[PDB]
Every structure is written in C-alpha cells, then in structure tokens.
Design a protein around this motif. Structure first.
Motif, mmCIF file in Angstrom:
data_model
loop_
_atom_site.group_PDB
_atom_site.id
_atom_site.type_symbol
_atom_site.label_atom_id
_atom_site.label_comp_id
_atom_site.label_asym_id
_atom_site.label_seq_id
_atom_site.Cartn_x
_atom_site.Cartn_y
_atom_site.Cartn_z
ATOM 1 N N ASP A 124 20.973 -76.738 -39.516
ATOM 2 C CA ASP A 124 20.961 -75.454 -38.822
ATOM 3 C C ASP A 124 21.864 -75.491 -37.594
ATOM 4 N N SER A 125 22.892 -74.649 -37.596
ATOM 5 C CA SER A 125 23.829 -74.585 -36.480
ATOM 6 C C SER A 125 23.704 -73.265 -35.726
ATOM 7 N N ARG A 126 22.598 -72.557 -35.937
ATOM 8 C CA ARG A 126 22.371 -71.280 -35.267
ATOM 9 C C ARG A 126 22.538 -71.425 -33.759
ATOM 10 N N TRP A 127 22.171 -72.594 -33.249
ATOM 11 C CA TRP A 127 22.272 -72.875 -31.822
ATOM 12 C C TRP A 127 23.723 -72.827 -31.350
ATOM 13 N N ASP A 133 26.217 -71.660 -33.423
ATOM 14 C CA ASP A 133 26.825 -70.502 -34.069
ATOM 15 C C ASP A 133 26.843 -69.300 -33.131
ATOM 16 N N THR A 134 25.903 -69.273 -32.188
ATOM 17 C CA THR A 134 25.809 -68.180 -31.228
ATOM 18 C C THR A 134 27.135 -67.972 -30.500
ATOM 19 N N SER A 193 14.763 -68.674 -31.990
ATOM 20 C CA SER A 193 14.046 -69.916 -32.257
ATOM 21 C C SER A 193 13.770 -70.672 -30.962
ATOM 22 N N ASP A 196 25.117 -80.423 -35.168
ATOM 23 C CA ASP A 196 24.456 -79.621 -36.191
ATOM 24 C C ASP A 196 24.435 -80.357 -37.527
ATOM 25 N N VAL A 199 19.093 -66.542 -30.838
ATOM 26 C CA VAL A 199 18.832 -67.218 -32.101
ATOM 27 C C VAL A 199 17.451 -66.862 -32.633
#
Length: 117
Positions: A98-101, A103-104, A51, A95, A49
């Motif tokens: 931000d759902s990057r966590w 989304d991975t 982050s 989420d 991510v």
C-alpha cells in the motif's frame, strides 16, 4: 522482491529569524523543510488517505502560554527536531503493498517530487 530503503540523513540546519529550516539529505539531494511542515503533512495523510498512520509524533499544546514560551531557534529543541523525520520518510517511501501514504499529493509535494518540464 523486498522493498528498498531510502538513504535519508539530516545533518544541516539554518536558523533564521523567521523560522528554522532543516537540510534533509536524500538520494536526490538536500531538501530544506520545517518541522511544522512535517506535522501538517502527517495529520493530512490521515484525512487524505483515510487511514491511521503508525508514525510516532509527539506534539506539544500551544494556546497562549507566555511564561512557558519556547524559542524556535533553541538548539535543545532543534537537536531533537532533527531526528524522527528521516525515519518517517524511509518507512513511508518504503511502500510494498500500500503506497496510499506516498501516493497522496502532499507526500509527492512534500519534497517537491513533481514532474519538471
């Protein structure tokens, strides 16, 4: 609207000569995973991510300590290893902006959340 919390409660553990699995209960069902899998998932999101993760995860050094050896099948260590996982999921799965966590690919594959056909 607000985010939706996921119901994750771990109350299952099967000690195996190869490794200790954990039965993590969720809206979908009980998933069997290993603590070592949670750690490799965390640090990953950091590099995947890009982050910083605000999840508390205390890791212990393991070079070649023969006197300070530990038993992976020790209830004392298993007891604590149980908690901390469910929380790491709820917050993540929760989420909002931000759902990057989640989304991975690692997160979606963490609990086998692929697309069955």
């Amino acid at each position: 609207k607000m985010s939706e919390k996921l119901r994750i409660k771990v109350d299952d553990v099967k000690i195996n000569p190869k490794y200790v699995l954990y039965g993590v209960s969720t809206p979908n069902k009980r998933l069997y995973k290993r603590y070592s899998e949670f750690w490799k998932l965390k640090t990953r999101l950091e590099r995947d991510v890009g982050s910083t993760i605000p999840y508390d995860f205390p890791e212990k050094p393991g070079v070649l300590d023969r006197r300070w050896q530990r038993r992976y099948d020790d209830p004392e260590m298993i007891d604590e290893r149980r908690i901390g996982l469910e929380r790491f999921l709820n917050e993540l799965y929760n989420d909002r902006f931000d759902s990057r966590w989640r989304d991975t690919k690692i997160a979606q594959d963490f609990l086998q959340l692929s697309k069955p056909n």
